[PDB]
Each structure stands twice: as structure tokens, then as C-alpha cells.
Amino acid sequence: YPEIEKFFPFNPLDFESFDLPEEHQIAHLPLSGVPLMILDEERELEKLFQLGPPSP
């Protein structure tokens, strides 16, 4: 009368961990910060320094 052996069933699908490769990971990053508001020079003074001849 042989004793009962063990029996440890395993589903082959329980191996998958739905983890992306670290180049596709977005939600674990600290999406904190609002990086200012830059309103570029409406007037480019660069071309405001020329008078040429002493016109009357």
C-alpha cells in the first residue's frame, strides 16, 4: 500500500505579468509640474538701432 504522493497543479498561464518593458511605462512617473508660460517678444527690438543719415 504505497503512500499518497504530492500533487501541485499549475496553470501555464499564471506565468504572465502584464508589465511593459520600462520604455513603455508612463503612469509610474511623477507627472508633477507646469513649466511656465513663455510669450515670445511680440516686437523684435533687434532691428530698432539704425538712423543712417542726419535727415532734416
Binding site: 505579468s17 508612463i26 508660460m37
Partner: protein
């Protein structure tokens, strides 16, 4: 002449000289000179001499001329009575000089002129000083005009000389330096004690003169003296604080100051420049809130330049500090201007803006009703500066507190009529930033939750919180405020319209992220309105590009063309050769490529797209370029999803040569690039810091859109693991940002992905979650509140009504599922029509051609598919030919797009016509096959290949074999292509020919141009030519006549090297035993095993084990007898010796006489190679099948042939690779009686054998070429410490072995198990399953696999088949990573019996000696364990035969 006569003579002589000048004569002047010579005797004589000298100088018009000028000045100096006469004389001399502007003047001539001018000036000033000159208002004015007239002439000469002054003549300019600065001194003194009007007009020319005088040096890099020239005026003008010069043009005063400030700032001296800006504003003290702007810009320019030089102390010198005594309102306006100018720079000025806002809060008195306004405006600016980098060392006010205080102050303000526009502006801006900083609060709250570590339905219902109504309402009101501001058509009259433009950009980005696309459309229309009002065509072009991209994301491509044309029209007005123009031009080209794609003019679109893809401007490092590459990659994926008949062949080659071979690869690269952008935002020298704010909410919206594309695509392909991975990533992001609509979308997607894997519980959980979220979103036919108005919500609702019908049909309700599908059938048309009307009203056009075909078309196509699949099970000959015809027509109007659904509908039509008609089925299915061959749906591709290889068979041998070959392991093929692309990417980034070769081997569109079966057949013939020697490939496949069933007819296709493909059809549908029954019995055995292993009575336990083993051996015997029957020598080797071939020829002819259609030789050559073991009943069935008309003499002839071929030998060196379907892989074919002595392994697809060969050609696979070493082995013995019975014995024998470095009892670190697979030849795992916990499929796929994997666990090499999806398991990831051989169990086994098996295998193989076949010892060790069929038939091998070295 008497004194009076002499005075009259001077007047007459001057008149004579003036008369000579009156006609510009010289001979007459000579006559007057003779008259003067006659008068020569006086004070007027020197004066007359000067006039004569002037005439001589006029005649000269060089060195002598210079000497004459000096001589004139010298005599004039002595004269200056005589000085009074010298004036009239100097006027004549100056008249000659006026006509002597030869421009060819040298500093010496200018110095001589300066001498004469200075002498005249001294005499003129003395004459003007004389009370008489001042006494006569006009007379003083006349002398004053004369002085200024002379100075105007002087600077003209100076500028003429400065123009003549070149790089070499700079020394000459430095010579004129003296007179220039002295000139300024004289000019200022001339303005002393002057009448207001006279002083102001003279001030204008005075400043103008020095501006021209100073500019010359500045225009030649000589600031020091340029500053010395303007220093006196700037100081005098600045010191006189009283505004005594209100009229003097601010435009002039500006120039002089501007010049000195630049001269100092270009020479450092930032401190002096700051004081000069203070003096500048001091001069413009009582000016308008307009002229003060330029000084303030120069302030910020001097301040920012100071920072570059480390002049941090300039920041310490602030305006409020510098301009101590200034009217509050004026200082508040000046600090507003400084705030705006700081907003204009690009170099981390957050702290400076914070200082300005703090001082503006301190200066604005909250008491005044006109101070509450300034309080609120500075508070929204403080909110802006705090949602960026919150300052905990100052203020002690939170950002969400500042903004709410501002909103209350604004609600307390009442305007009149001129400021209502400013009120609407600031209120809308406050509401926008209220939303922004509530979202930042949510972000940091989630960050704190996730940081709380110490030492998801609930999460969804918690994050919902019914807070959507609070936040979205504020943006919905900011939009209305901006709209009432900008829609009137009149001028806006706001502070900075640029700020309105930037806020509208942020609002469009935010709406895109909250998934409200129509609101973003309206916001972009208003941004285009404002952009024309501001004459900024960059922004108009960008707004039109965005409107076009958003209209193409929706259905309507007609309205996108108008706005693309508008974008081009705005592009005309740009500089070109500038990054803005390059970017907007590439964007418009991309939009036109997409318009061609949707307009079915695909070849011009591909030409455009390849022009875009080959531009070196698309690769320059900047974030807008990365967004453009993202859109490029999504368009490339949209072009890779078209059938090959739409495009030419070289077009496909050059399109795939860019680096992206499938839409999945393109979309994952899009996702990767979208992540790399965020690493740049949420961190440079701030060069690209211009659009970071809008980009931060554009990148998140694009991430969610890319994830929707990458999830809806990978799930339709059947790859549900990666699809769920991306779906979970996006759900995590959306719960982080707390966006209900996007998370509802992604929950419905995850529900469909779980329904694909037959998980009704998880799908119903997700469905209830989205029902909760949709009840939250709605504000609680033609209008269903917020749901109907929004397209995204109607889409998510119809996807709910689709996945719910799918679940309702999976559990088996039918009527309810059909009613839900018919609801989805009436839902998409009305949804598209209401979106059409909404888009027309929003853009304000007339009659949009055709309805909007967005994702509603795809969901209606899937509804048609699922409603056609249910007419098969209820073939009542009614609404089946009327639901499939309508679906076919629908899907046939949009030809290049809805292609998988037309293939599904064609397959269903073929299955309905199945029960000439065979040719009709074949052509229909060939249409479908070419419809999905480029990127197959894995589940449809199998049904389509096997139905097409069943209709078309023996009438076309090679084509039938090719279809059977492609119907296996499609998902593994997709995954291998993706893995190879990732390998190429990482290998290029780290620093490959075999990689590209394998990619070509697995590619879906590496075909030539052809009709229906020809180019496919040619590629298949090449692949057949690639088979190695000594290997037989049997592809067993179940031909399924319904999608979702099992099937009975076994398609067996044998593949050899230099032999035609021999295929056979084994219809096991009447053979009593069936094959469905075999699979049912196997499932029953595996269920009974686990239900029995719970009993504790050892006797009943062993009885059940024995009964299951007997059942298992009966099943194995039945496979060979009934399942294969006579057609079972197709798996046996081929006789190298002649004999079968000659008999094959003779029998071919003679049986062809007997009525054998499709006579073939290789079939009989392989069926007679095993004649030694051929039984009379096999010969009976074979004969009665081959030759039905005259069978008896066919048997007799076959009996004679086998009797003549009685003695033979199968080849010693040979091998059989079994390619099984997803349903037949679980049966233990390797343990059938016939295949017990024969080496037999498995592979996923036939292409994997060729891949192993290709890798063997180059290396990287030492074991499959050299041999396994007895040493060099890593073992994992009992890592979970459950099984000690094994642990003890296996510990003894393993430790006894030399060179074996492993673990025992403990779970191995992932690093050492990585090194175990990589650096070793053998990986003996004695434990639970297949590693899994410490080594999962992704970790090995990320790895190279050198070692043989002897994984001795329960279901180690089993593939889990869930639903209509193909098998998944870690063995696939092992052999996709290059594992030569992978041994593992197939079903659950027990402990000590599997230990006995493992001990036998390891004692037989290891220790046999060098060159010991492993597959020989897996069958030799299969007779050691007690239950020889229940735990002996379980071990299975994947790969190629290996041997010990």
C-alpha cells in the same frame, strides 16, 4: 572808406559775394574780388578776404584746400565789428563748404571744418549772447537757428565721414571723437534759458543730432565715445525730473537713451545700464502706459544678461527699490510691464516672476475697489508661478488657495463698459488655472498615496468621487468667457492678447486630454480668430493644422481639407528657412498624406509620406519634432494596415525599408517616443522651453490616443497579453490624472480583452465599473445629455453594448445578445449623423459630403461580424442572407479600411454556401485571404487558410500546403516580429544580418506581385527549399467549419527536403471515436486527476491513479489506430534505399488505371517505406480509399507490392518535428506506439525550423551545433521548500555531479537564473511549474537562451488555450529566445513518480557518454516511472534534437 562807408562796403562786398552766389558765378566773383582788392586798405577786409577764400574753396570743390580751410579759421579766430563782419564772411565761407561736400573728407578736413565751425560757433554764441541779439526775439532765434543749422551740417559731415570710415578708417573715426563730444556740450548750452516751445523743438533736433552722432560709433563698435557723446544729454534730460518737455517726441528721447544703454550693456556695465533705464523712465515720467514698455524691455534685457555674467546682485536691485518715489499706480503698471517682459525671456525666470508678483501684491491696496482687480490678477499670476515650482519658504499661501481668493475677488468686481473685456479675460484665465492647479493637487495626492509604503473596482469608485462636475464646469465656463470676448468681431482691448492666445492653446490641450474633442475644436477656432487679429501666421498655421488633425481623428475628412488649405495659405506668409516654417510645412504634408489615405488615393499619399520620412529636418532634436515623428509613425501604421493590392510593390518595399514592418511595431515605437518626450518635460538650456506648457497636456492626450490605437489593434490580432498590458498602463495613467472619460474607454477595452480570453467575471466587473463611470459623467434619440453631444462617450457606450452582448452570448442567452447587437446596429448611424450636425454647427459650414466614418464604422462592422456568426447556429433561412448581404455591402463601400471585417464576412458567406460552387467559395476566400494576408487576425487567418486548403487540395498541392503552414502559430509570428524589431533597436542603441534575415522569413508582405495563389506559392517553394536534411515536418491541423468550434477533419501535411509537399485529409467525423471525443476524454482525464488528488484514502487514491493511467493508455492507442489510421506512415522516416520508389512508379500507373485521381509518387514512396510494419487493414483502408471504383485489385496489387518490399530499414540519422494546432498540442502524440523508437520534437510553426537553421549558419546557438556539456549546469532544486521527498535524493545526486552550480531550498535571485539561461548549457529545474515566479516569459524573452531547459514541473510545457485564442505558455518564450531544446511536462504530474522519471532520464543521458541523443533517453526514461501512461506520457520536448558533447 569812412567807418559807416566801410560798414556799407562790407554789406556791398557781402552782396557782391552773394550776387556771385546768386548766379553761382566765378568770373563775376573775380570782378568783385578786384573791387575788394581796390577797397583793400579794414575789419571788413578780413571778412571780404574770407568770402574770396570761400570762392577759391568753392572753385577747388586737397591738402591746399585743407590748408585754406585752416587759414580761413585762423584769420576768423583773430577777427573773432571784425567778428560781426567775420560772421557774414563765415556764412560765405560755410556756403563754399556747403558746395564742398565731396564726401571725400578726411579727419584732417573735418578737424579743419571743426576749427572753422567752432570759431564761427564761438563768435555766433557771443553775438547771440549780446543783449541786442536776445532782445530781438527773431534775431536771437535767427542766430539760434544759425548755430543749430551749422551743427546739423557738422553731423552730416561726421556721418558722411563715418560712412567713409571703414575698418581701417576706424582710427579716423576715433580722431573725430573729440569734436563730436565737444559738439554735444555746445548743443546743451544752446538749450539754456529757452522758451518752452523753442526749447522743446530745439531739444528734438538736439537729441536727434547726438542720436545720429552717437549712432555712427555704435555702428562701428565704439561705445565708450558713443556713450561719452550721449552721456551729457542723458544725464541732463534724466536729472530734470519736472516734465518740462511734454511735447519733445518720446520717439527721439528713446533713441538717445536706447543707444547709451546698449553701448554700456554690450560692454557689460549692467549696473550703469540699469541706472540709465532708471534715467530713461525718469525722462518719460508723465508718459502714457505705452512709451514706458521699451525701457522696461531694456531693463529685463540688462537683468537677464546680468544673470549670464553671475551679476546676481542686479536681481537684488529691483524696480520698486530703484524707483523709490513713484505714484503707486505708476509703479504697479511698471511692475506689470516687467512681469510681461520676464514672461518673454527663455531662461528659468520663475523666481524673478515670483518676486515681481509678491511686490505687486504688496503694492496693490486691497481696500480700493480698483485694487481688488489688481489683487485678483496678481493672484492668478501667483497661481501660475506656484503650480510650476511651489515656494514653501515664502507666502505661506497654497496655489489652490491663491486662485480661489482671486476668483472670489473677481466675482466681487463690477466693470463699467470699457473694462468688461479685461474682466472676461481675467475671469476665464482664473478658471483655467483653477482647473490646472486642482489637477496638480490630484497628482501630488496620488503621489503621496503611492509613496505611503511604510515597511481595482474600489479604486475606480473612489477616484470617481463625483468631482467631474466641479472641475470640467470651470473649463466649460472659461470657454464661454473667451468666446463672448473674441466672437464680437470688434477689437478685444485686453492687456496682452498673446496671453489670451497662450491660454487658449492650453485650454485646447486640456480639452484634448479630458477627451472633449469638440470643445477643443471650438477653442482652436477661437485661437485662429485671435491669431489673425494679432498678425501671427505661425499660430494661425498651427491652429489650422490642429483643427485638421482633430477633424481627421474624427470621421469627416471633407472639413479637414478646408483647414489644410487655410494652413498652407498662412504658410505663404512666413520667412521660410526657419524651423517654424519647416515644421508647419512637414505637418501640412503629413496632413495631406493622411487626406489621401482616407480619400483612397493611397499612392500619392505614400509618395508624400516617404518624402516626409526622408527629410533631415524630421530628426533634429526638439520636442515639436518628436510630436511630428509620433504623428508620422501613426500614419505609417495607418499605411501598413492596407492590403498589398492598394499599393505598388516597390512602394511597399521602400515603405517597409524605413524601419517599421507592421502597424504594431510602428505604434509601439510611437508609444516609446511619447514616453521619451515626457522624460524631457517632467525633468536643458531652456531653448525648447517655449511650448512646454501646452506640450505637457498634449503629450498625455497623445499617449492615451496611442494606447487606444495600440490596444484596439493588438486585441484584434489576438495578442491579448500585450494589449492588456498597455490597457493597464493607460488605466493607471488615467486614474492618476483622475479622468473619467479616458478610463471609461480603457475599461471597456479591457472588458473586451477579457471577453477574448473567456473571463466572464472580470469582464462583468469592468462593465459595471464603466456603467458607474458613465452614470457619473452624464449630467443627471436626438439628444441624450452629455453622452449624445460627445462622440467619445457615444463610442464608449456602443462598445459597452457590444462587449455586453459578447458576454451575454458567451454564457448562452442568444436573444438578449442579438437584441443588444441590433441596438448597436441602430446606434452607429444616428451617432454619426449627430456628430455630423454638431461638427457642421461648430465649424459653421454648409452640407458636409457623406457622414463621419470614425470608429463607429469599425464597431458597426464588428456588430455585423458577430451578428453574422450567429446566423450559422440558427440557420432558419431568414435574416441570415439579409444580415450578411447588408454587412458585405457596408464593408464593401469602405474598401481599403474595413478589411478584417470583410474577410470575416466573406468566410461566413463561404461557410453558408458550403451547406460550380467550389470555385465560387475559392475565389471569395481568396479575396478575403489577400484582404488579411498583410497583417492577419490570427483567429480568422487559420479558419481562412484551412478552409481554402480544404476546397483547394491536390488540384493544387503546393498552395494547399502553404495555407496549412500559415494556419499555425500566427500570434507567435507577430510576437517574434515585434521581438526582432526590439532586438534591432537595442543592438543599434548599444553599439545584424541574421536578425534581418529572420525578419524577412517571418514577414507577412515579403511577396512579389501576382494574382491569387502564385507569389505566395513561390515564397513557399523557397521556404521548402530551405529545409535542412534529415528532418520530416508533419503539420497536423484541425479544419474548423465554424468559428468557435473544434472540428473533426485532420489536415496532415508532410514536408521533406527534395520532395513535393504531401498532404492528406483525414475526415474523422464518422469514425465512432472522433477527435472531438478524444479531446473531451483528455480534458475529462485531467479534471478527474485533480478531483481525485484530494482524497486521503491511499487505496482509493491508487485505484483512481490506475484507472486514469488505463484511460490514458487507451487514449494514446486510439490516437494511432482511429485518429490517424492508415495515414500514419506520414510521420515515419523515408527509406533512403531504392525500392519504395520503383514500386511507387508502378503502383502509380496501375492504380491510376484503377481510378486513382491525382496520382502521385512521393505519397506511395513514403507509404511504402514503412511496409515492414504495414498491417493488412491499413493496406485495405488505403486501397479502398485511393481507388474506389476498382478497389479489390488495388488491394491485391498493394499486397503484392508490400510483400515484395517486406525487408527494409528506416534511416538511422533522422528526425521528426511535429507542428500541431492549438487544440491538438495537448494530446500526447510523442507517446503513440509508432513514434516511441523515433526521435520526435515539436515546434510552433514550420518557419521556426528554418529560423534555427539560419541561426546555426551564423552561430549564437552553440548547443544546437556543438553539443551540451556534462558540466556547466545550473539547477533549482525545490525553491518553495514544499517537496522534500525529491529534495533529499535529488540533492544527493546533484551535489554528486561535477561543475553544477545551483540553488536548493531557496528561491533563486532573478540575476542568477538569468545567468543560468544565458551562460550555461543545461538548466535542470526540479520544482513547481516552469520557473514562472523568478523567471517569467518576459524575462526570458528579454534574454538569450543558450541552455537546454529541463523544466520538471506540473504543466511545464503545456499551452493554455482560452477561448478562440491560440495557446500561450512559457515554452513559446523559451523557443522564441533561442532555446535549442525545452523538455517539460504536458499535464499535471505527481511527486515521486516524476522524480523517478527525472532520475532515469538524468542517469541515462548524463553518464551514457559523448554524443548521446537526448530524445532517445526521454523515451528510455519513460518506462521507469510506475504510471507509465499518466505521468510518463506527460514529458514533451520542444526544439531540435540535442546531444551531449
Amino acid at each position: 572808406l569812412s567807418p559807416q562807408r566801410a560798414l556799407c562796403l562790407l554789406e556791398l562786398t557781402l552782396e557782391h559775394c552773394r550776387r556771385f552766389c546768386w548766379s553761382r558765378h566765378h568770373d563775376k566773383a573775380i570782378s568783385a574780388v578786384e573791387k575788394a582788392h581796390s577797397y583793400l586798405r579794414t575789419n571788413l577786409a578780413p571778412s571780404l578776404q574770407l568770402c574770396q577764400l570761400g570762392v577759391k574753396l568753392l572753385q577747388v570743390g586737397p591738402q591746399a584746400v585743407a590748408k585754406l580751410l585752416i587759414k580761413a579759421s585762423a584769420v576768423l579766430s583773430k577777427s573773432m565789428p571784425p567778428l560781426r563782419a567775420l560772421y557774414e564772411s563765415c556764412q560765405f565761407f560755410l556756403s563754399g563748404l556747403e558746395r564742398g561736400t565731396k564726401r571725400r573728407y578726411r579727419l584732417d578736413a573735418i578737424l579743419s571744418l571743426f576749427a572753422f565751425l567752432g570759431g564761427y560757433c564761438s563768435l555766433l554764441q557771443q553775438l547771440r549772447d549780446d543783449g541786442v541779439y536776445g532782445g530781438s526775439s527773431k534775431q536771437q532765434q535767427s542766430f539760434l537757428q544759425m548755430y543749430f543749422q551749422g551743427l546739423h551740417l557738422y553731423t552730416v559731415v561726421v556721418y558722411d565721414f563715418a560712412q567713409g570710415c571703414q575698418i581701417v578708417d576706424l582710427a579716423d573715426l576715433t580722431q573725430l571723437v573729440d569734436s563730436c563730444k565737444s559738439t554735444v556740450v555746445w548743443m546743451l548750452e544752446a538749450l539754456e534759458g529757452l522758451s518752452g516751445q523753442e526749447l522743446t523743438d530745439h531739444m528734438g533736433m538736439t537729441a536727434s543730432y547726438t542720436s545720429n552722432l552717437a549712432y555712427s560709433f555704435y555702428s562701428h563698435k565704439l561705445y565708450a565715445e558713443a556713450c561719452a557723446i550721449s552721456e551729457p544729454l542723458c544725464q541732463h534730460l534724466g536729472l530734470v525730473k519736472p516734465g518740462t518737455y511734454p511735447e519733445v517726441p518720446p520717439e527721439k528721447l528713446h533713441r538717445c537713451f536706447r543707444l547709451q544703454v546698449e553701448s554700456l550693456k554690450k560692454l557689460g556695465k549692467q549696473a550703469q545700464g540699469c541706472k540709465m533705464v532708471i534715467l530713461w523712465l525718469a525722462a518719460l515720467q508723465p508718459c502714457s502706459p505705452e512709451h514706458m514698455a521699451e525701457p522696461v524691455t531694456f531693463w529685463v534685457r540688462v537683468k537677464m544678461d546680468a544673470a549670464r555674467a553671475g551679476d546676481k546682485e542686479l536681481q537684488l536691485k529691483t524696480l520698486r527699490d530703484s524707483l523709490s518715489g513713484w505714484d503707486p499706480e505708476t509703479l504697479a503698471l511698471l511692475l506689470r510691464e516687467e512681469l510681461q517682459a520676464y514672461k518673454a525671456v527663455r531662461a528659468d525666470t520663475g523666481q524673478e516672476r515670483f518676486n515681481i508678483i509678491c511686490d505687486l501684491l504688496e503694492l496693490s491696496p486691497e481696500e480700493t475697489p480698483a485694487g481688488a482687480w489688481a489683487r485678483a490678477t496678481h493672484l492668478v499670476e501667483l497661481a501660475q508661478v506656484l503650480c510650476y515650482h511651489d515656494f514653501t519658504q515664502q507666502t505661506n499661501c497654497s496655489a489652490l488657495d491663491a486662485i480661489r481668493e482671486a476668483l472670489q475677488l473677481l466675482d466681487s468686481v463690477r466693470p463699467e463698459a470699457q473694462a468688461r473685456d479685461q474682466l472676461l479675460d481675467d475671469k476665464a484665465q482664473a478658471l483655467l488655472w483653477l482647473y490646472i492647479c486642482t489637477l496638480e493637487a490630484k497628482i501630488q495626492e496620488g503621489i503621496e498615496r503611492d509613496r505611503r509604503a511604510q515597511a481595482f473596482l474600489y479604486s475606480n469608485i473612489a477616484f470617481n468621487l463625483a468631482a467631474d462636475a466641479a472641475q470640467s464646469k470651470c473649463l466649460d465656463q472659461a470657454l464661454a468667457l473667451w468666446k463672448e470676448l473674441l466672437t464680437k468681431g470688434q477689437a478685444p482691448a485686453v492687456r496682452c492678447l498673446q496671453q489670451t492666445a497662450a491660454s487658449l492653446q492650453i485650454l485646447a490641450a486640456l480639452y484634448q486630454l479630458v477627451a472633449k474633442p469638440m470643445q477643443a475644436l471650438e477653442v482652436l477656432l477661437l485661437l485662429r480668430i485671435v491669431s489673425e487679429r494679432l498678425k501671427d501666421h505661425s499660430k494661425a498655421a498651427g491652429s489650422s493644422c490642429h483643427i485638421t488633425q482633430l477633424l481627421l481623428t474624427l470621421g469627416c475628412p471633407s472639413y479637414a481639407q478646408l483647414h489644410l488649405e487655410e494652413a498652407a495659405s498662412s504658410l505663404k506668409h512666413l520667412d521660410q528657412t526657419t524651423d517654424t516654417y519647416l515644421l508647419l510645412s512637414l505637418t501640412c504634408d503629413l496632413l495631406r498624406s493622411q487626406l489621401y489615405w482616407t480619400h483612397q488615393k493611397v499612392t500619392k499619399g505614400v509618395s508624400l509620406l516617404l518624402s516626409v520620412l526622408r527629410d533631415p529636418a524630421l530628426q533634429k532634436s526638439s520636442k515639436a519634432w518628436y510630436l511630428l515623428r509620433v504623428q508620422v509613425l501613426q500614419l505609417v501604421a495607418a499605411y501598413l494596415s492596407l492590403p498589398s493590392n492598394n499599393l505598388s510593390h516597390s512602394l511597399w518595399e521602400q515603405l517597409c525599408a524605413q524601419g517599421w514592418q507592421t502597424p504594431e511595431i510602428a505604434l509601439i515605437d510611437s508609444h516609446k517616443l511619447l514616453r521619451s518626450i515626457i522624460l524631457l518635460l517632467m525633468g536643458t538650456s531652456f531653448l525648447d522651453y517655449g511650448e512646454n506648457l501646452v506640450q505637457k497636456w498634449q503629450v498625455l492626450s497623445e499617449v492615451l490616443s496611442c494606447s487606444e490605437k495600440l490596444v484596439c489593434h493588438l486585441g484584434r490580432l489576438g495578442s491579448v497579453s500585450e494589449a492588456k498590458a498597455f490597457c493597464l498602463e493607460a488605466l493607471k495613467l488615467t486614474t492618476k490624472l483622475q479622468i473619467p472619460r479616458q478610463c471609461a474607454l480603457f475599461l471597456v477595452l479591457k472588458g473586451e480583452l477579457e471577453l477574448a480570453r473567456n473571463d466572464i467575471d472580470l469582464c462583468q466587473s469592468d462593465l459595471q465599473q464603466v456603467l458607474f463611470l458613465l452614470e457619473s459623467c452624464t449630467e443627471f434619440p436626438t439628444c441624450d445629455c452629455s453622452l449624445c453631444a460627445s462622440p467619445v462617450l457615444t463610442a464608449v457606450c456602443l462598445r459597452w453594448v457590444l462587449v455586453t452582448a459578447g458576454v451575454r452570448l458567451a454564457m448562452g442567452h442568444q436573444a438578449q445578445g442579438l437584441d443588444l447587437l441590433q441596438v448597436v446596429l441602430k446606434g452607429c448611424p444616428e451617432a454619426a449623423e449627430r456628430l455630423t450636425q454638431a461638427l457642421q454647427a461648430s465649424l459653421n459650414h454648409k452640407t458636409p459630403p457623406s457622414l463621419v466614418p470614425s470608429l463607429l464604422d469599425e464597431i458597426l462592422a464588428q456588430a455585423y461580424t458577430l451578428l453574422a456568426l450567429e446566423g450559422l447556429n440558427q440557420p432558419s433561412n431568414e435574416s441570415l442572407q439579409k444580415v450578411l448581404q447588408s454587412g458585405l455591402k457596408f464593408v464593401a463601400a469602405r474598401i481599403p479600411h474595413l478589411e478584417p471585417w470583410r474577410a470575416s464576412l466573406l468566410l461566413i458567406w463561404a461557410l453558408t454556401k458550403l451547406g460550380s460552387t467550389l470555385d465560387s467559395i475559392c475565389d471569395s476566400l481568396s479575396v478575403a485571404f489577400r484582404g488579411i494576408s498583410h497583417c492577419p487576425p490570427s483567429g480568422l487567418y487559420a479558419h481562412l487558410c484551412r478552409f481554402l486548403a480544404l476546397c483547394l487540395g491536390h488540384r493544387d498541392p503546393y498552395a494547399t500546403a502553404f495555407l496549412v503552414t500559415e494556419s499555425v502559430s500566427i500570434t507567435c509570428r507577430h510576437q517574434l516580429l515585434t521581438h526582432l524589431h526590439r532586438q534591432l533597436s537595442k543592438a543599434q542603441k548599444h553599439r545584424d544580418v541574421p536578425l534581418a534575415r529572420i525578419q524577412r522569413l517571418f514577414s507577412f508582405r515579403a511577396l512579389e506581385s501576382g494574382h491569387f495563389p502564385q507569389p505566395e506559392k513561390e515564397s513557399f517553394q523557397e521556404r521548402l527549399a530551405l529545409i535542412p536534411s534529415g528532418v520530416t515536418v508533419c503539420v497536423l491541423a484541425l479544419a474548423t467549419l465554424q468559428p468557435g468550434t473544434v472540428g473533426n477533419t485532420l489536415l496532415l501535411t508532410r514536408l521533406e527536403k527534395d520532395s513535393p509537399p504531401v498532404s492528406v485529409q483525414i475526415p474523422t467525423g464518422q469514425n465512432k471515436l472522433h477527435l472531438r471525443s478524444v479531446l473531451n476524454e483528455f480534458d475529462a482525464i485531467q479534471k478527474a486527476q485533480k478531483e481525485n488528488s484530494s482524497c486521503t484514502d491511499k487505496r482509493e487514491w491508487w485505484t483512481g491513479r490506475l484507472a486514469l493511467d488505463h484511460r490514458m493508455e487507451v487514449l494514446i492507442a486510439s490516437l494511432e489506430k482511429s485518429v490517424l489510421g492508415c495515414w500514419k506512415g506520414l510521420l515515419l522516416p523515408s527509406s533512403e534505399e531504392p525500392g519504395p520508389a520503383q514500386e511507387a512508379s508502378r503502383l502509380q500507373e496501375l492504380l491510376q488505371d484503377c481510378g486513382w485521381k491525382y496520382p502521385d509518387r512521393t505519397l506511395l514512396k513514403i507509404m511504402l517505406s514503412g511496409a515492414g510494419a504495414l498491417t493488412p487493414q491499413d493496406i485495405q483502408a488505403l486501397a479502398y480509399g485511393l481507388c474506389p471504383t476498382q478497389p479489390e485489385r488495388a488491394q491485391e496489387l498493394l499486397n503484392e507490392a508490400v510483400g515484395r518490399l517486406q525487408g527494409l530499414t528506416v534511416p538511422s540519422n533522422s528526425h521528426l518535428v511535429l507542428v500541431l494546432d492549438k487544440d491538438l498540442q495537448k494530446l500526447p502524440w510523442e507517446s503513440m506506439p509508432s513514434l516511441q523508437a523515433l526521435p520526435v520534437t515539436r515546434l510552433p510553426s514550420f518557419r521556426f525550423l528554418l529560423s534555427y537553421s539560419i541561426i546555426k549558419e551564423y552561430g549564437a546557438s552553440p548547443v544546437l551545433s556543438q553539443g551540451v556539456d556534462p558540466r556547466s549546469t545550473f539547477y533549482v532544486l525545490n525553491p518553495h521548500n514544499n517537496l522534500s521527498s525529491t529534495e533529499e535524493q535529488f540533492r544527493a545526486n546533484f551535489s554528486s555531479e561535477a561543475g553544477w552550480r545551483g540553488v536548493v531550498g531557496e528561491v533563486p535571485r532573478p540575476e542568477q537564473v538569468q545567468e543560468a539561461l544565458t551562460k550555461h548549457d543545461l538548466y535542470i529545474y526540479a520544482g513547481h511549474g516552469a520557473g514562472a515566479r523568478f523567471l517569467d516569459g518576459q524575462a526570458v524573452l528579454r534574454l538569450s537562451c543558450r541552455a537546454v531547459a529541463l523544466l520538471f514541473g506540473c504543466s511545464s510545457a503545456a499551452l493554455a488555450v482560452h477561448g478562440n485564442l491560440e495557446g500561450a505558455g512559457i515554452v513559446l518564450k523559451y523557443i522564441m529566445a533561442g532555446c535549442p531544446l525545452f523538455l517539460g511536462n504536458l499535464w499535471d504530474v505527481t511527486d515521486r513518480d516524476i522524480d523517478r522519471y527525472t532520475e532515469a532520464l538524468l542517469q541515462g543521458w548524463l553518464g551514457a557518454g559523448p554524443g548521446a541523443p537526448l530524445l532517445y533517453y526521454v523515451n528510455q526514461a519513460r518506462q521507469a516511472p510506475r504510471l507509465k501512461y499518466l505521468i510518463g506520457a506527460a514529458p514533451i520536448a520542444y526544439g531540435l534534437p540535442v546531444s551531449l558533447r
